[PDB]
Amino acid sequence: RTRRPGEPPLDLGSIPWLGYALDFGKDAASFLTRMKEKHGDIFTILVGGRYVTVLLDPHSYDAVVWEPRTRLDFHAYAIFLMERIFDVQLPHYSPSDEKARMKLTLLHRELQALTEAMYTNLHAVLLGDATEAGSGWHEMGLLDFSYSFLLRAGYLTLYGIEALPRTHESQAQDRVHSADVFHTFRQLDRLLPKLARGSLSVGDKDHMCSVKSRLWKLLSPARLARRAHRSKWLESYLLHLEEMGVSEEMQARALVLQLWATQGNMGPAAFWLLLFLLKNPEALAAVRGELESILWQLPQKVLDSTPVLDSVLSESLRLTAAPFITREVVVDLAMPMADGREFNLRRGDRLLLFPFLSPQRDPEIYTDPEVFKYNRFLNPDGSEKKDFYKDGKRLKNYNMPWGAGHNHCLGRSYAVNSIKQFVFLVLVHLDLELINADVEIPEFDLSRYGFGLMQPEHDVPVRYRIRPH
Ligand code: HEM
Ligand SMILES: CCCCCCCCO[C@@H]1O[C@H](CO)[C@@H](O)[C@H](O)[C@H]1O
Ligand SMILES: Nc1cc(N2CCCCC2)nc(N)[n+]1[O-]
């Protein structure tokens, strides 16, 4: 490939066809940071036979993310995930249509219904497990801890419970069942990045197929039909699939895709948040102080009146949420930059924006971006800090864990509420400690850049107990 007039800087690397496939795959953030240093805020790279133009000027993001599908296609990842990763085939499939239908089931009123059920399920699973284990300290990995309880509760909230009214045995059954779902799901979640790259070994392939087969059985419509207090989201989705004449077996596959889609981020998000608090005594004291003040007067103020916790969650996501925002270039076109520049992109190129690098870890926007500063999103007077700058201009987009434009989180309020509820339960109802107070924060699994929340390369040992009194 030879650069044409008005195109971004072009960097093909050394290896024919593959280009920077290895570098990008191994550690996308480090690789792209170097490319930014070399080329500036926009550049084109060869990666695995594809030409990818990377845009890293956060002021220029807004234009891109709202472009019509006639210019920049925002359906490609959804199709790839549905058909190529989760093995789902739907008739007349349109990601926009599916998204619009889901929105209608996730309006403010319904998200508030989910929030109420979520607290009940978080409480039931957390205190249920803790009660079964008994009053002592119990040792666990913090990710296993956070991901298990959030996913199990999220599953019970969206997909329903064993019985209503709730009984001792039905709740116990949901603890065992949800644990099975989680343990099976985690095997898929660990293998997903390798599946996406097509790098599974013969043995890995058999493992993934076995896990998929089990999950498809567990979340079959026949199994789900008997469950109580199913979410409107689920009921509507099932009705939609039925109306399209989708088989119950294919519905199962679609439902497993949704399990990963909706539950693959909250647990990891909470893991990092709790870890940051445990490693930063002042931050932890501020959060506990805020929550205890509310307790002394789920108390509704925990959701609507936790300014310190809001900053903490924003700060944790700033450091750890790393989704790619991608588009396929549909036609040869000119893309405007915020500074007045214009760059030509070619039909068939991929466009990649990476908020993790900028704005989120941009040292011109945030002072010491690598550091967890619990009050980064607080003004001195305690009000929310919303004013961040780059290149002499106020940023519209400064922290983007929920996406932007056409592809943004439809469950944000519920996701935020769920994480807050979990943190409240853990910090107020439990004692929670690092085994080693001096343990260093683990590196990311660097191969997972682009999906959403990062996961740690290894877990962090903690211990918890029910608060003695
Ligand atoms: C911390 C947790 C979460 C984060 C950071 C997050 C972030 C995101 C992002 C970045 C997208 C855009 C995806 C893309 O098109 O590339 C998205 C989409 C979406 N999210 Fe979330 N999300 C979270 C949790 C949830 C939860 C708990 C729900 C509901 C239970 C939810 C519902 C949705 C829906 C329905 C979409 C649109 C899917 C589609 O395009 O068909 N999210 N989210
Ligand atoms: C790299 C995995 C993180 C998710 C990125 C979502 C946007 C593109 O998703 C996929 O990425 C693959 C590898 O780059 C490409 O080969 C596929 O064509 C593309 O659909
Ligand atoms: N982060 C994501 C991603 C996601 N996807 C659905 C399929 C298309 C892009 C990824 N769905 C949901 N619910 N969340 O929360």
Short mmCIF file of C-alpha atoms in Angstrom, two decimals, residues 8-458:
data_model
loop_
_atom_site.label_atom_id
_atom_site.label_comp_id
_atom_site.label_asym_id
_atom_site.label_seq_id
_atom_site.Cartn_x
_atom_site.Cartn_y
_atom_site.Cartn_z
CA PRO A 8 -2.96 10.15 7.46
CA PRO A 9 0.67 9.04 7.99
CA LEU A 10 1.04 5.42 6.86
CA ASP A 11 3.05 2.78 8.72
CA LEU A 12 3.18 -0.75 7.28
CA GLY A 13 5.82 -2.22 9.60
CA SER A 14 8.24 -4.89 8.36
CA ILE A 15 6.24 -8.13 8.02
CA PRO A 16 4.26 -8.43 4.74
CA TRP A 17 0.45 -8.67 5.15
CA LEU A 18 0.64 -9.20 8.94
CA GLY A 19 2.18 -5.77 9.58
CA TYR A 20 1.77 -5.02 13.28
CA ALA A 21 -0.61 -7.91 14.08
CA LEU A 22 1.74 -9.25 16.76
CA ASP A 23 2.46 -5.89 18.44
CA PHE A 24 -1.16 -4.75 18.40
CA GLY A 25 -2.41 -8.12 19.70
CA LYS A 26 0.16 -8.41 22.51
CA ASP A 27 -0.38 -4.96 24.04
CA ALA A 28 -2.55 -2.59 22.04
CA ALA A 29 -2.25 0.31 24.49
CA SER A 30 1.56 0.34 24.60
CA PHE A 31 1.82 -0.13 20.85
CA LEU A 32 -0.61 2.69 20.07
CA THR A 33 1.06 5.01 22.61
CA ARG A 34 4.35 4.56 20.71
CA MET A 35 2.56 5.18 17.41
CA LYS A 36 1.08 8.41 18.83
CA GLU A 37 4.61 9.54 19.81
CA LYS A 38 5.89 8.66 16.33
CA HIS A 39 3.03 9.98 14.17
CA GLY A 40 0.69 12.20 16.20
CA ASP A 41 -3.05 11.91 16.87
CA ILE A 42 -3.96 10.17 13.60
CA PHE A 43 -2.16 7.44 11.64
CA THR A 44 -2.79 4.34 9.53
CA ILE A 45 -1.27 0.95 10.33
CA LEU A 46 -1.27 -2.46 8.69
CA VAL A 47 -2.67 -5.07 11.09
CA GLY A 48 -3.36 -8.65 9.93
CA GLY A 49 -4.06 -7.63 6.33
CA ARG A 50 -6.39 -4.78 7.36
CA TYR A 51 -5.54 -1.08 7.18
CA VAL A 52 -6.58 0.55 10.41
CA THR A 53 -6.65 4.32 10.82
CA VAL A 54 -6.32 5.17 14.51
CA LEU A 55 -7.73 8.47 15.79
CA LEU A 56 -6.61 9.62 19.25
CA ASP A 57 -7.66 13.29 19.37
CA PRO A 58 -10.56 13.30 21.86
CA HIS A 59 -11.86 16.62 20.47
CA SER A 60 -12.39 14.87 17.09
CA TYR A 61 -14.30 11.89 18.49
CA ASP A 62 -17.76 13.49 18.48
CA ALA A 63 -17.93 13.88 14.70
CA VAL A 64 -16.94 10.24 14.09
CA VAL A 65 -19.19 8.45 16.57
CA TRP A 66 -22.41 10.00 15.21
CA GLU A 67 -21.69 9.46 11.49
CA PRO A 68 -24.42 7.62 9.55
CA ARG A 69 -23.92 3.96 8.59
CA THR A 70 -23.76 5.08 4.94
CA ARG A 71 -20.33 6.56 5.73
CA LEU A 72 -19.06 4.69 8.82
CA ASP A 73 -20.49 1.26 9.58
CA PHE A 74 -21.10 0.65 13.30
CA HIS A 75 -22.60 -2.87 12.87
CA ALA A 76 -19.43 -4.89 12.19
CA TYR A 77 -18.41 -5.82 15.77
CA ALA A 78 -21.98 -6.77 16.73
CA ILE A 79 -22.21 -9.11 13.70
CA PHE A 80 -18.75 -10.55 14.43
CA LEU A 81 -19.62 -11.19 18.08
CA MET A 82 -23.05 -12.65 17.42
CA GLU A 83 -22.24 -14.91 14.48
CA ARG A 84 -18.50 -15.65 14.80
CA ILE A 85 -17.97 -15.80 18.58
CA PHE A 86 -21.30 -16.90 20.04
CA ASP A 87 -22.46 -18.93 17.02
CA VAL A 88 -25.85 -17.16 16.77
CA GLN A 89 -27.79 -16.96 13.48
CA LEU A 90 -30.92 -14.78 13.37
CA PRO A 91 -33.19 -14.04 10.37
CA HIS A 92 -33.24 -10.53 8.82
CA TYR A 93 -30.68 -9.57 11.49
CA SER A 94 -29.95 -5.87 12.10
CA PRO A 95 -27.85 -4.68 15.08
CA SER A 96 -29.66 -1.29 15.00
CA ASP A 97 -33.08 -2.97 15.13
CA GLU A 98 -32.09 -5.28 18.00
CA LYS A 99 -30.59 -2.31 19.85
CA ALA A 100 -33.73 -0.17 19.40
CA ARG A 101 -35.98 -2.97 20.71
CA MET A 102 -33.76 -3.47 23.77
CA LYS A 103 -33.85 0.27 24.50
CA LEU A 104 -37.65 0.14 24.76
CA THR A 105 -37.24 -2.49 27.51
CA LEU A 106 -34.54 -0.53 29.35
CA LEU A 107 -36.16 2.87 29.88
CA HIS A 108 -35.73 4.66 33.23
CA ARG A 109 -38.77 3.00 34.89
CA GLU A 110 -37.62 -0.53 33.99
CA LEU A 111 -34.02 0.12 35.03
CA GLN A 112 -35.38 1.16 38.44
CA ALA A 113 -37.33 -2.11 38.71
CA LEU A 114 -34.11 -4.02 37.93
CA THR A 115 -32.25 -1.98 40.55
CA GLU A 116 -34.65 -3.05 43.32
CA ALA A 117 -34.46 -6.74 42.36
CA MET A 118 -30.66 -6.46 42.09
CA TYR A 119 -30.24 -5.35 45.71
CA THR A 120 -32.40 -8.25 46.88
CA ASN A 121 -30.36 -10.70 44.80
CA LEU A 122 -26.97 -9.24 45.78
CA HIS A 123 -27.98 -9.41 49.44
CA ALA A 124 -29.41 -12.94 49.06
CA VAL A 125 -26.38 -14.39 47.28
CA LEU A 126 -23.69 -12.54 49.30
CA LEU A 127 -25.19 -13.06 52.75
CA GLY A 128 -26.47 -16.51 51.75
CA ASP A 129 -22.96 -17.68 50.78
CA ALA A 130 -21.44 -15.98 53.84
CA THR A 131 -23.97 -17.60 56.19
CA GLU A 132 -23.31 -21.06 54.70
CA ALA A 133 -19.57 -20.52 55.21
CA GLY A 134 -20.03 -19.31 58.80
CA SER A 135 -18.87 -16.42 60.98
CA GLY A 136 -15.07 -16.67 60.53
CA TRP A 137 -12.72 -15.03 58.03
CA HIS A 138 -12.85 -16.62 54.57
CA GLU A 139 -10.07 -16.41 51.97
CA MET A 140 -10.83 -15.77 48.30
CA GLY A 141 -9.42 -13.94 45.29
CA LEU A 142 -10.88 -10.43 45.04
CA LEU A 143 -11.81 -10.87 41.36
CA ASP A 144 -13.44 -14.24 42.07
CA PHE A 145 -15.28 -12.51 44.96
CA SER A 146 -16.47 -9.49 42.95
CA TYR A 147 -17.25 -11.28 39.68
CA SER A 148 -19.11 -14.20 41.33
CA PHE A 149 -21.46 -12.05 43.37
CA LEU A 150 -22.19 -9.44 40.72
CA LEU A 151 -22.70 -11.95 37.89
CA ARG A 152 -24.81 -14.32 40.00
CA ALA A 153 -27.05 -11.46 41.18
CA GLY A 154 -27.20 -9.93 37.68
CA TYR A 155 -28.16 -13.32 36.26
CA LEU A 156 -30.93 -13.79 38.86
CA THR A 157 -32.17 -10.23 38.22
CA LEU A 158 -32.37 -10.48 34.43
CA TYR A 159 -33.22 -14.17 34.00
CA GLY A 160 -35.44 -14.69 37.06
CA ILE A 161 -35.40 -16.71 40.29
CA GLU A 162 -36.41 -20.21 41.43
CA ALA A 163 -39.59 -19.16 43.25
CA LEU A 164 -41.79 -16.25 44.27
CA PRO A 165 -42.61 -15.94 47.10
CA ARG A 166 -39.04 -16.51 48.24
CA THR A 167 -38.32 -19.53 50.45
CA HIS A 168 -35.29 -20.84 52.35
CA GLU A 169 -34.88 -23.73 49.87
CA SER A 170 -35.58 -21.70 46.70
CA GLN A 171 -32.92 -19.12 47.63
CA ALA A 172 -30.49 -21.93 48.46
CA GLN A 173 -31.26 -23.47 45.05
CA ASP A 174 -30.58 -20.15 43.31
CA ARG A 175 -27.25 -19.89 45.11
CA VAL A 176 -26.19 -23.33 43.82
CA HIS A 177 -27.65 -22.75 40.32
CA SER A 178 -26.20 -19.25 39.89
CA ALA A 179 -22.80 -20.55 41.07
CA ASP A 180 -22.95 -23.23 38.33
CA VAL A 181 -23.80 -20.56 35.74
CA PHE A 182 -20.88 -18.39 36.95
CA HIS A 183 -18.31 -21.17 37.04
CA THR A 184 -19.25 -22.35 33.55
CA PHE A 185 -19.42 -18.81 32.19
CA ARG A 186 -15.96 -17.92 33.52
CA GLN A 187 -14.42 -20.73 31.48
CA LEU A 188 -15.88 -19.16 28.31
CA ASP A 189 -14.89 -15.65 29.42
CA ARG A 190 -11.24 -16.68 29.88
CA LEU A 191 -11.09 -18.30 26.40
CA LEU A 192 -13.00 -15.60 24.50
CA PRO A 193 -9.97 -13.43 23.48
CA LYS A 194 -8.23 -16.49 21.96
CA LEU A 195 -11.45 -17.51 20.21
CA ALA A 196 -11.76 -13.97 18.78
CA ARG A 197 -8.22 -14.14 17.36
CA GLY A 198 -8.77 -17.71 16.13
CA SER A 199 -5.84 -18.98 18.18
CA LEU A 200 -7.50 -21.79 20.15
CA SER A 201 -5.59 -25.07 20.32
CA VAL A 202 -7.41 -28.31 19.45
CA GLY A 203 -7.83 -28.89 23.22
CA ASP A 204 -8.99 -25.31 23.86
CA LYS A 205 -11.55 -25.70 21.04
CA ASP A 206 -12.99 -28.82 22.67
CA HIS A 207 -13.04 -27.02 26.04
CA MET A 208 -14.84 -24.01 24.54
CA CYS A 209 -17.35 -26.18 22.69
CA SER A 210 -18.10 -28.17 25.85
CA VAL A 211 -18.60 -24.98 27.86
CA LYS A 212 -20.86 -23.48 25.17
CA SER A 213 -22.89 -26.70 25.03
CA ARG A 214 -23.42 -26.59 28.81
CA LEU A 215 -24.32 -22.87 28.82
CA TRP A 216 -26.81 -23.34 25.99
CA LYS A 217 -28.48 -26.08 28.06
CA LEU A 218 -28.53 -23.98 31.24
CA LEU A 219 -30.10 -20.92 29.58
CA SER A 220 -32.51 -22.83 27.33
CA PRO A 221 -35.99 -21.23 27.02
CA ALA A 222 -37.46 -24.48 28.45
CA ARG A 223 -35.36 -24.05 31.62
CA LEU A 224 -36.06 -20.29 31.80
CA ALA A 225 -39.84 -20.69 31.38
CA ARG A 226 -40.31 -21.95 34.96
CA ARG A 227 -38.43 -19.05 36.57
CA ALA A 228 -40.13 -16.30 38.60
CA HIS A 229 -39.75 -12.49 38.41
CA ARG A 230 -38.11 -12.50 34.98
CA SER A 231 -37.08 -9.07 33.71
CA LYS A 232 -39.11 -7.22 31.06
CA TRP A 233 -35.85 -7.14 29.09
CA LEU A 234 -35.82 -10.96 28.97
CA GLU A 235 -39.58 -11.44 28.43
CA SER A 236 -39.56 -8.98 25.53
CA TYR A 237 -36.42 -10.49 23.99
CA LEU A 238 -37.92 -14.00 24.12
CA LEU A 239 -41.19 -12.76 22.59
CA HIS A 240 -39.19 -11.08 19.81
CA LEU A 241 -37.18 -14.24 19.07
CA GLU A 242 -40.39 -16.33 19.03
CA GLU A 243 -42.02 -13.89 16.58
CA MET A 244 -39.02 -14.25 14.26
CA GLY A 245 -39.51 -18.04 14.36
CA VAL A 246 -36.13 -18.63 16.01
CA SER A 247 -35.73 -22.18 17.37
CA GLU A 248 -35.50 -22.63 21.13
CA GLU A 249 -31.95 -23.96 20.71
CA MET A 250 -30.88 -20.83 18.79
CA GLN A 251 -32.69 -18.65 21.36
CA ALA A 252 -30.47 -20.34 23.98
CA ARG A 253 -27.38 -19.24 22.03
CA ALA A 254 -28.71 -15.68 21.78
CA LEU A 255 -29.38 -15.68 25.53
CA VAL A 256 -25.83 -16.83 26.28
CA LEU A 257 -24.51 -14.01 24.08
CA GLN A 258 -26.61 -11.62 26.19
CA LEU A 259 -25.30 -13.15 29.42
CA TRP A 260 -21.74 -12.34 28.35
CA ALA A 261 -22.73 -8.96 26.90
CA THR A 262 -24.55 -7.74 30.02
CA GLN A 263 -22.52 -9.48 32.75
CA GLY A 264 -18.93 -9.44 31.42
CA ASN A 265 -18.05 -5.96 32.77
CA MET A 266 -19.69 -5.22 36.16
CA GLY A 267 -17.72 -7.81 38.16
CA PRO A 268 -14.32 -6.77 36.80
CA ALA A 269 -15.27 -3.07 37.30
CA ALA A 270 -16.06 -3.68 40.98
CA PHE A 271 -12.85 -5.70 41.41
CA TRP A 272 -10.69 -2.75 40.36
CA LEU A 273 -12.73 -0.28 42.38
CA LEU A 274 -12.41 -2.32 45.58
CA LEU A 275 -8.71 -2.97 44.92
CA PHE A 276 -8.03 0.75 44.46
CA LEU A 277 -9.86 1.47 47.72
CA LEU A 278 -7.94 -1.24 49.60
CA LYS A 279 -4.61 0.16 48.32
CA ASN A 280 -5.57 3.75 49.23
CA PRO A 281 -6.58 4.15 52.92
CA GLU A 282 -7.63 7.83 52.52
CA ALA A 283 -9.97 6.91 49.64
CA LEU A 284 -11.41 3.94 51.52
CA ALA A 285 -11.99 6.14 54.61
CA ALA A 286 -13.76 8.75 52.46
CA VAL A 287 -16.06 6.15 50.89
CA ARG A 288 -16.80 4.40 54.20
CA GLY A 289 -17.37 7.80 55.87
CA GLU A 290 -19.86 8.81 53.21
CA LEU A 291 -21.74 5.49 53.35
CA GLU A 292 -21.84 5.38 57.16
CA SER A 293 -23.20 8.95 57.34
CA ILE A 294 -26.06 7.82 55.07
CA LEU A 295 -26.59 4.64 57.14
CA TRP A 296 -26.95 6.68 60.37
CA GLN A 297 -29.20 9.05 58.34
CA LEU A 298 -31.01 -0.21 50.62
CA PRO A 299 -31.23 3.38 51.91
CA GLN A 300 -32.05 5.37 48.76
CA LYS A 301 -29.36 7.97 49.48
CA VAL A 302 -26.70 5.34 48.63
CA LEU A 303 -27.82 5.59 45.00
CA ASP A 304 -28.66 9.30 44.65
CA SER A 305 -26.45 10.90 47.34
CA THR A 306 -22.94 9.42 47.14
CA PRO A 307 -20.76 12.11 45.49
CA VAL A 308 -17.50 10.56 46.76
CA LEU A 309 -18.45 7.08 45.53
CA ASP A 310 -19.44 8.60 42.15
CA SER A 311 -15.95 10.08 41.77
CA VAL A 312 -14.38 6.79 42.85
CA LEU A 313 -16.36 4.79 40.27
CA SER A 314 -15.55 7.29 37.51
CA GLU A 315 -11.87 7.17 38.49
CA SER A 316 -11.77 3.37 38.60
CA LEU A 317 -13.39 3.16 35.14
CA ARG A 318 -11.01 5.82 33.78
CA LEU A 319 -8.10 3.54 34.62
CA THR A 320 -9.58 0.18 33.65
CA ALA A 321 -12.28 0.43 30.96
CA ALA A 322 -10.67 -0.12 27.55
CA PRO A 323 -13.26 -0.74 24.81
CA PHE A 324 -12.35 -0.03 21.21
CA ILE A 325 -14.68 2.23 19.25
CA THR A 326 -14.49 0.99 15.67
CA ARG A 327 -16.12 1.71 12.31
CA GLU A 328 -15.77 0.22 8.86
CA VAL A 329 -15.21 2.84 6.17
CA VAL A 330 -18.07 2.30 3.72
CA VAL A 331 -16.96 4.75 1.02
CA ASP A 332 -13.88 6.87 0.31
CA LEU A 333 -14.44 9.91 2.52
CA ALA A 334 -12.97 12.96 4.22
CA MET A 335 -12.99 12.98 8.03
CA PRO A 336 -12.77 16.37 9.76
CA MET A 337 -10.47 17.04 12.73
CA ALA A 338 -11.39 19.48 15.51
CA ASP A 339 -8.39 21.70 14.65
CA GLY A 340 -9.58 22.31 11.06
CA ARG A 341 -7.57 19.52 9.43
CA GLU A 342 -9.22 16.99 7.10
CA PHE A 343 -8.03 13.43 6.38
CA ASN A 344 -9.00 11.03 3.61
CA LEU A 345 -10.00 7.46 4.54
CA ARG A 346 -10.42 4.58 2.05
CA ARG A 347 -13.38 2.26 1.51
CA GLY A 348 -12.65 -0.97 3.41
CA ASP A 349 -10.33 0.58 5.99
CA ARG A 350 -11.17 0.22 9.68
CA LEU A 351 -11.32 3.34 11.85
CA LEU A 352 -10.29 2.87 15.50
CA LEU A 353 -10.75 5.31 18.40
CA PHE A 354 -9.28 4.33 21.78
CA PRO A 355 -10.60 6.43 24.71
CA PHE A 356 -8.40 4.44 27.15
CA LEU A 357 -5.31 6.13 25.68
CA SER A 358 -6.96 9.53 25.20
CA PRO A 359 -8.80 11.11 26.93
CA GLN A 360 -8.63 8.63 29.81
CA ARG A 361 -4.85 8.25 30.25
CA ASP A 362 -3.84 11.48 28.50
CA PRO A 363 -1.29 13.31 30.70
CA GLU A 364 -2.28 16.67 29.17
CA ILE A 365 -5.85 16.21 30.40
CA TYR A 366 -5.31 14.43 33.72
CA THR A 367 -2.44 15.12 36.11
CA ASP A 368 -0.57 11.83 36.70
CA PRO A 369 -3.07 9.75 34.67
CA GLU A 370 -1.52 6.47 35.85
CA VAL A 371 -2.49 7.15 39.47
CA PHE A 372 -5.79 6.38 41.24
CA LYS A 373 -6.87 9.70 42.75
CA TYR A 374 -10.23 9.02 44.40
CA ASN A 375 -11.28 12.69 44.25
CA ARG A 376 -10.19 13.34 40.65
CA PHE A 377 -13.81 14.08 39.70
CA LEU A 378 -14.47 16.33 42.68
CA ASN A 379 -14.09 20.09 42.92
CA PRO A 380 -12.52 21.50 46.13
CA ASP A 381 -16.01 22.36 47.44
CA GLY A 382 -17.07 18.72 46.93
CA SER A 383 -19.20 19.32 43.82
CA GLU A 384 -18.79 17.20 40.66
CA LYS A 385 -15.82 18.18 38.49
CA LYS A 386 -16.92 18.24 34.85
CA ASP A 387 -14.38 20.66 33.35
CA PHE A 388 -11.34 19.11 31.64
CA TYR A 389 -9.15 20.64 28.90
CA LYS A 390 -6.84 19.80 26.04
CA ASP A 391 -5.13 22.03 23.47
CA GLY A 392 -6.79 25.14 24.92
CA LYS A 393 -10.35 23.80 24.60
CA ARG A 394 -12.88 22.30 27.00
CA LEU A 395 -13.46 18.59 26.36
CA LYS A 396 -16.94 17.33 25.57
CA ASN A 397 -15.64 13.76 26.00
CA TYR A 398 -13.20 13.18 28.88
CA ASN A 399 -14.00 9.72 30.30
CA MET A 400 -15.68 7.19 28.01
CA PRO A 401 -16.18 3.75 29.66
CA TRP A 402 -19.78 3.59 28.38
CA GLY A 403 -18.95 4.26 24.73
CA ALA A 404 -20.25 7.15 22.65
CA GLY A 405 -22.59 8.08 19.81
CA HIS A 406 -24.35 5.18 18.12
CA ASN A 407 -22.67 2.56 20.32
CA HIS A 408 -23.23 3.51 23.94
CA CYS A 409 -24.35 1.58 27.02
CA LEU A 410 -28.12 1.22 27.35
CA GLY A 411 -27.87 -0.18 30.90
CA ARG A 412 -25.61 2.50 32.42
CA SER A 413 -27.90 3.55 35.31
CA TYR A 414 -28.50 -0.07 36.25
CA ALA A 415 -24.76 -0.89 35.95
CA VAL A 416 -23.80 2.07 38.16
CA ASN A 417 -26.54 1.25 40.70
CA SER A 418 -25.47 -2.41 40.86
CA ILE A 419 -21.82 -1.61 41.48
CA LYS A 420 -22.77 0.92 44.17
CA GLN A 421 -25.08 -1.59 45.89
CA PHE A 422 -22.31 -4.20 45.91
CA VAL A 423 -19.76 -1.74 47.30
CA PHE A 424 -22.24 -0.67 49.98
CA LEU A 425 -22.86 -4.28 51.07
CA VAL A 426 -19.14 -5.10 51.10
CA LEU A 427 -17.97 -1.96 52.93
CA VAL A 428 -20.81 -1.69 55.46
CA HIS A 429 -21.97 -5.30 56.12
CA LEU A 430 -18.53 -6.98 55.88
CA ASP A 431 -14.94 -6.70 56.95
CA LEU A 432 -12.69 -7.00 53.87
CA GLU A 433 -8.90 -7.09 53.83
CA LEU A 434 -5.95 -7.73 51.57
CA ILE A 435 -3.99 -10.74 52.81
CA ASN A 436 -0.85 -8.73 52.09
CA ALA A 437 -1.43 -4.98 52.56
CA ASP A 438 1.72 -4.35 50.50
CA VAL A 439 0.61 -6.49 47.52
CA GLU A 440 1.15 -4.68 44.23
CA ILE A 441 -1.73 -4.07 41.83
CA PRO A 442 -1.51 -6.82 39.19
CA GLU A 443 -0.83 -6.06 35.54
CA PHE A 444 -3.73 -6.41 33.10
CA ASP A 445 -4.21 -9.39 30.88
CA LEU A 446 -2.85 -7.22 28.06
CA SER A 447 -4.44 -9.36 25.34
CA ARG A 448 -7.95 -8.24 26.44
CA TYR A 449 -7.65 -4.61 25.34
CA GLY A 450 -10.65 -3.61 23.24
CA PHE A 451 -13.48 -5.62 24.80
CA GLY A 452 -14.45 -3.49 27.79
CA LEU A 453 -13.26 -3.74 31.37
CA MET A 454 -9.73 -5.05 31.72
CA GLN A 455 -9.11 -8.16 33.82
CA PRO A 456 -6.00 -8.82 35.98
CA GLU A 457 -3.25 -11.25 34.89
CA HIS A 458 -3.70 -12.93 38.27
#
